[PDB]
């Protein structure tokens, strides 16, 4: 009978994982402050990685990778992509970005005055540099500014923007498992590049949207649309590139966060956020380190966390993931 503690009550994904564990009859949940746990479903901030793996007689496992924030912070992801030789200054899949503080960005925006090319960026969106730079100083904290993708792929009927959330699970062995169910999070508003301050058709976040149910189109429909409208498949036109981006990011930070020879072990669920332009090119927007899941897919994905990340380490009495081979 394995043991686990819960330290993030606000977690929909692990609210499910703990209910699944208890219902196998072979897991018992302890009080959050009891140190004799096998598994820590930990808190998001200041998780005590330094108190793990010092329990004699306890294999210990936690659902976060120490150091993985360097991927899941707008400003940290920029610094990691610009300074790691594995991810050249030119990734070809990351949008141009700079970390401006509020108390070399201008060198590039001026370049766009040469050809009067697109010059929309984001934090929030604007067209002149001053409009935005005054906004990062009005907020007070570090913002990151980034080239807005002025020609996104638009779903018809609707002429609508969208982003793709992929859920990636990385187990204690550093296997990279990409959940096969993605979600498109679409804008019900027809896209138009004239009024940015009306950011209902630009910001494609589910909340910001307070054709398809829940402004969410799963991979079944989207692959069918690509076949009918563009004569290609989701795998060929977009998913190859997504698997390449996931593998590249996670292979980059692997020496810094791997728990292979460590006295405790980590896995973590990531949500990768992508953006497909009109030439069927895939771009990486952000990496979310504590992602939520779509309602239809909570059952399948939380069960698969148990199978792959937890029961893999603590066994009990065809698959939903693609292994990204590195």
């Amino acid at each position: 009978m394995y043991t686990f503690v819960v330290r993030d009550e606000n977690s929909s994904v692990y609210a499910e994982v703990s209910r699944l564990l208890l219902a196998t009859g072979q897991w018992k949940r302890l009080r959050k402050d009891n140190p004799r746990f096998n598994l820590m479903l930990g808190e998001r901030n200041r998780l005590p990685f330094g108190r793990l793996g010092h329990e004699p007689g306890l294999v210990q496992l936690v659902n976060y990778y120490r150091g993985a924030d360097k991927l899941c912070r707008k400003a940290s992801l920029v610094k990691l992509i610009k300074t790691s030789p594995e991810l050249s200054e030119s990734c070809t899949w990351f949008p141009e970005s700079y970390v401006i503080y509020p108390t070399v960005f201008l060198a590039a925006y001026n370049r766009r005055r040469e050809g009067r090319e697109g010059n929309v960026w984001i934090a929030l969106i604007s067209s002149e540099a001053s409009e935005l730079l005054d906004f990062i100083d009005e907020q007070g904290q570090v913002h990151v500014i980034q080239k807005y993708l002025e020609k996104p792929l638009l779903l018809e009927p609707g002429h609508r923007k969208f982003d793709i959330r992929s859920w990636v699970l990385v187990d204690h062995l550093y296997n990279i498992y990409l959940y096969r169910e993605g979600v498109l999070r679409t804008s019900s508003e027809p896209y138009n590049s004239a009024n940015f301050q009306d950011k209902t058709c630009h910001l494609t976040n589910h909340c910001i949207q307070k054709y398809e149910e829940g402004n969410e189109m799963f991979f079944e429909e989207f692959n069918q649309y690509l076949m009918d409208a563009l004569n290609t498949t989701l795998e060929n036109s977009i998913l190859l590139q997504i698997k390449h981006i996931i593998r590249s990011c996670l292979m980059c930070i692997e020496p810094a966060i791997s728990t292979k020879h460590l006295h405790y072990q980590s896995f973590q669920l990531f949500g990768f956020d992508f953006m497909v332009d009109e030439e069927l090119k895939v771009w990486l927007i952000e990496v979310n380190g504590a992602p939520a899941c779509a309602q239809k897919l909570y059952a399948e994905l939380c069960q698969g966390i148990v199978d792959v990340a937890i029961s893999s380490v603590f066994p009990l009495a065809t698959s939903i993931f693609i292994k990204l081979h590195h």
């Binding site: 793996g53 004699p56 020879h261 460590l262």
Partner: protein
């Protein structure tokens, strides 16, 4: 030449000191009676082994050591053990009644009755020193004597030898071989009262030594004897530069200069490789590159923690054996790329290297196999603060209910010394955290 005096305090300190002096004698060719056929300067010398051994007109080489325990059991084994010849009876100081795992009993009640005698014996060795460098103090954090008497001794040594360096070798408490439920209390109390009196302290977590013995020596349930022979190897790597010809870490002052830029943050992580079982018949001998790479594996550290998530302020490599500079720089070259090694901005990214050609000496019949090359890495990384966090958490758990506090108050300590010592620890963790982010 400049002499060093070793002081061993309590059970852990005395037993580790015995392991070390046994090892020193094998490494310098001094037999259990203290005769050293190699010393042709009879009854004298300013050789660098005279840093640790004085000589009699009869040519006996006597450790510059004082052993002190508040009870007689342990030092009595020295007094009748195989190296009973080595020490002068005046060097072995014993009480009748020990500290009972109670910091305040060792520091206040019992400590107050023996501190003048011990400092009088310490003064007798200092008077045989032409230019004394300072002290190496061995002790547990956990014992009542180790924690409480050592912190009283460290205060007085500052008073009496204001100009002398003091180094610590400190055994950090592990539940797998622990003696007392209150060791977190004693650990914090002795750290708080000792911090400003110690220039450099090497913490050995018994948990880490224990797991190296199980993994790499294949010992099912390590004994103190297994732990101490491995610990004494590490101590020997660290002190070899004081006892041998060389140009790195030649006096105690150089340890501070090389490993401690900020004075409170004086706890370097030690990492040792290779640890090879002596029953392992076929052992492929490890290369310079392999043993150096192993210096960045947490499984080989004296304290388990993750240096990838801290920053370095300094780093020394200490090799014993068939090692030449070129292999070390080649090994360092390819490890710089493959590893997360972040130094603080106000420190150069670099390594001080020391090579001693005599390969490691191993106790005959012990557990460590002889090897052709070994390395001890000393790195001042903020990740060692993980150990402070663990201890302080355990202290907070007990002290919030004031569990066991009456044992300390009943020895004349005030409850407030607890929260004072804890607040100092709180500032210590905050210092590490500023430097390391």
């Amino acid at each position: 030449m400049r002499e060093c005096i070793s002081i061993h305090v309590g059970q852990a300190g005395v037993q580790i000191g015995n392991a070390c002096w046994e090892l020193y004698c094998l490494e310098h060719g001094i037999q259990p009676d203290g005769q050293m056929p190699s010393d042709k300067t009879i009854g004298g010398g300013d050789d660098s082994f005279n840093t640790f051994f004085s000589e009699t007109g009869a040519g006996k080489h006597v450790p510059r050591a004082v052993f002190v325990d508040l009870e007689p059991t342990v030092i009595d084994e020295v007094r009748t053990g195989t190296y009973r010849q080595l020490f002068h009876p005046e060097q072995l100081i014993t009480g009748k009644e020990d500290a009972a795992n109670n910091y305040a009993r060792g520091h206040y009640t019992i400590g107050k009755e023996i501190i003048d005698l011990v400092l009088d014996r310490i003064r007798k060795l200092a008077d045989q020193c032409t230019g004394l460098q300072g002290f190496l103090v061995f002790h547990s954090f956990g014992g009542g004597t180790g924690s409480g008497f050592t912190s009283l001794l460290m205060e007085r040594l500052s008073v009496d030898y204001g100009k002398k360096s003091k180094l610590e070798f400190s055994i950090y408490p592990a539940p797998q071989v622990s003696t007392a439920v209150v060791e977190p209390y004693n650990s914090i109390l002795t750290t708080h009262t000792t911090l400003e009196h110690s220039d450099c302290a090497f913490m050995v977590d018994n948990e880490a030594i224990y797991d190296i013995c199980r993994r790499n020596l294949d010992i099912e349930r390590p004994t103190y004897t297994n732990l101490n022979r491995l610990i004494s190897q590490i101590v020997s790597s660290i002190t070899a530069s004081l006892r041998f010809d060389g140009a790195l870490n030649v006096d105690l002052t150089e340890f501070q200069t090389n490993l401690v830029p900020y004075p409170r943050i004086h706890f370097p992580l030690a990492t040792y490789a290779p640890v090879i079982s002596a029953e392992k018949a076929y052992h492929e001998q490890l290369s310079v590159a392999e043993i150096t790479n192993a210096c960045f594996e947490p499984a080989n550290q004296m304290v388990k923690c993750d240096p990838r998530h801290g920053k370095y302020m300094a780093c020394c490599l200490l090799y014993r054996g068939d090692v030449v500079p070129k292999d070390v720089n080649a090994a360092i070259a390819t490890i710089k790329t493959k590893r997360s090694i972040q130094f603080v901005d106000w420190c150069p990214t670099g390594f001080k290297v020391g090579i001693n050609y005599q390969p490691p000496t191993v106790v005959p019949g012990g557990d460590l196999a002889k090897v052709q090359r070994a390395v001890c890495m000393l790195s001042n990384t903020t990740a060692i603060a993980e150990a402070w966090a663990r201890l302080d958490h355990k202290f907070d758990l007990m002290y919030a209910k004031r569990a066991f506090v009456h044992w300390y108050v009943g020895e004349g300590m005030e409850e407030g010394e607890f929260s004072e010592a804890r607040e100092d620890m709180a500032a210590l963790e905050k210092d590490y955290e500023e430097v390391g982010v």
